[PDB]
Structure formats: C-alpha cells, structure tokens
Amino acid sequence: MKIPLDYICVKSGLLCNRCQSLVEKGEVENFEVDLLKQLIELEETQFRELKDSTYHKSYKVGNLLILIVTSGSQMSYQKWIKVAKALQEKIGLRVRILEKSNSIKSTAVQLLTPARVLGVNTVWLPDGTVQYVVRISKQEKRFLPADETSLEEALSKIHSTQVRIRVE
Ligand SMILES: [Zn+2]
C-alpha cells in the first residue's frame, strides 16, 4: 500500500530522521503510525490487494478511528469491511474505513452508515465561511454508528469545516 512513512521504519519501530520528523511535525500522528503497522502487517499476511491502495491522513475521535483511503482496483468494498474488523481486533478502538472524498455529502453517507441520511445542506455565512448540516430522520438516529456529537467532530475534522447533525 502507499503510505506516508517508510515500511522499514514502520515495521522496525525505529524511525529514520525523515519519518521521525513527520511524527514530530504531527503529519503522521502517533495513532496513525500504529495503523500503518497493522495495515502493512495485514497486507503481507492477509490482503495482497491492499498493496494497490493509498493511505491518507486519518483522524481519531474518542473510541473511534476513521481511516481515509483510496481503494486500489484490487480492493473490494467487502474486503474493506474485512480490513476494518481486522484493525478493530489488533487495535482496541472501533475502526471505520471511509474512502477519501472531496464532497462532504459523500463522506457523511459512508460514516453514518448503517443509518441513512435525509439530506445535506451547505450554507454560506456573510463571513464567507461554509458550514454543513447533515439531516437524518428521527428513526435513523437509533442506527447511528456512534453518538451524534462524535460523528460531528469526525466529519468536521476530515473536511476541516463545521459539520452538524440535525435529527429532525
Ligand atoms: Zn523512514
């Protein structure tokens, strides 16, 4: 798989100066480094298809890991759910693979699944700052994969903007 650190460094535990700086800089957070270990482990052992994918900056919020990726032409959406459960056993936290997307409506549909989303509103302040609102049926709120405020923080981090959930 394509990643932001050296395979040797990640698997070694011993970082070259270049990788170590990335971790100090914060570009590869510490929990991201653990993912990279378990990811490379999980492709040598279990998923040759992983080597076609691409790692992307990933976020952690509370008990939840959100992994952003680009799936290679080898990676079944099923296999990603398989990869998620693999990660969720090696690491303690819950794992959610989201494929990297540039619209906020795409990544909100993926995360909030199994719940279904009603719609997404963009809004532009007089400031010009853009905010987003993901509408969900009251029924669906019971199907959210994590409490609504953690999903809000998650979505807000990924797209570096304000994201809010309206249970209407
Ligand atoms: Zn290195």
Side-chain angles (χ1 to χ4, degrees):
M1 163 183 338
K2 175 56 190 176
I3 54 175
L5 300 186
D6 297 299
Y7 262 62
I8 168 65
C9 295
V10 166
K11 184 160 49 183
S12 174
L14 299 187
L15 276 77
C16 79
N17 177 60
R18 167 257 182 181
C19 297
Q20 178 69 295
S21 294
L22 294 200
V23 177
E24 294 164 357
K25 185 57 181 179
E27 296 190 2
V28 184
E29 299 183 59
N30 194 296
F31 93 95
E32 291 190 2
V33 181
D34 187 2
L35 293 174
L36 294 195
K37 309 169 185 177
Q38 312 288 356
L39 283 180
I40 64 101
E41 175 70 298
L42 261 286
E43 84 160 48
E44 327 195 280
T45 63
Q46 194 162 302
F47 296 99
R48 169 197 171 242
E49 33 267 61
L50 263 192
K51 183 181 180 180
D52 198 4
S53 312
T54 299
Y55 189 68
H56 288 300
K57 175 78 177 176
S58 300
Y59 308 94
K60 164 178 174 51
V61 52
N63 211 245
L64 188 70
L65 255 54
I66 303 95
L67 197 81
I68 313 303
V69 287
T70 300
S71 294
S73 303
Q74 313 284 260
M75 268 307 273
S76 170
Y77 173 62
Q78 310 175 62
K79 301 178 190 300
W80 283 119
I81 303 176
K82 294 178 178 179
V83 167
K85 296 170 177 176
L87 294 196
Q88 186 170 352
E89 305 155 1
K90 312 307 176 180
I91 306 99
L93 297 319
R94 309 172 181 181
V95 176
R96 268 296 182 115
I97 307 300
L98 300 190
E99 191 176 301
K100 182 178 181 180
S101 171
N102 183 59
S103 60
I104 180 174
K105 49 182 302 184
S106 303
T107 64
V109 181
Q110 306 176 61
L111 192 67
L112 279 198
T113 308
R116 305 180 180 182
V117 51
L118 190 272
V120 178
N121 316 337
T122 304
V123 284
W124 290 293
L125 294 201
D127 312 337
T129 69
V130 47
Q131 321 176 307
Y132 294 106
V133 187
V134 291
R135 294 169 60 187
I136 78 172
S137 169
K138 180 183 178 181
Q139 309 175 359
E140 299 316 297
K141 184 182 189 176
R142 157 199 170 182
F143 286 62
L144 281 203
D147 64 72
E148 50 180 359
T149 68
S150 293
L151 298 183
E152 295 181 301
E153 175 167 57
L155 283 178
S156 302
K157 290 183 174 185
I158 304 178
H159 299 291
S160 302
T161 173
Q162 169 163 355
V163 190
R164 282 181 175 177
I165 297 190
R166 179 188 293 173
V167 306
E168 32 183 61

